[PDB]
Amino acid sequence: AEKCSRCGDSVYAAEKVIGAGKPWHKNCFRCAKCGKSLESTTLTEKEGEIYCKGCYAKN
Ligand SMILES: [Zn+2]
Ligand SMILES: [Zn+2]
């Protein structure tokens, strides 16, 4: 397992998915910029790090 940074619990094989590079629950897609927790992989991905599509388009 590898630990989910948003919710604080360890993600085993629950809602475990890779977005950019890091393990994520599909509720817990925490943004590197603004920190808004997002849905599945629908947003913008950078190298091993995620950023919202809306917040990164603004920034
Ligand atoms: Zn989580
Ligand atoms: Zn964001």
From Swiss-Prot:
<feature type="domain" description="LIM zinc-binding 2">
    <location>
        <begin position="4"/>
        <end position="55"/>
    </location>
</feature>
<comment type="function">
    <text>Interacts with zyxin. May be a component of a signal transduction pathway that mediates adhesion-stimulated changes in gene expression. Totally down-regulated in transformed cells.</text>
</comment>
<protein>
    <recommendedName>
        <fullName>Cysteine and glycine-rich protein 2</fullName>
    </recommendedName>
</protein>
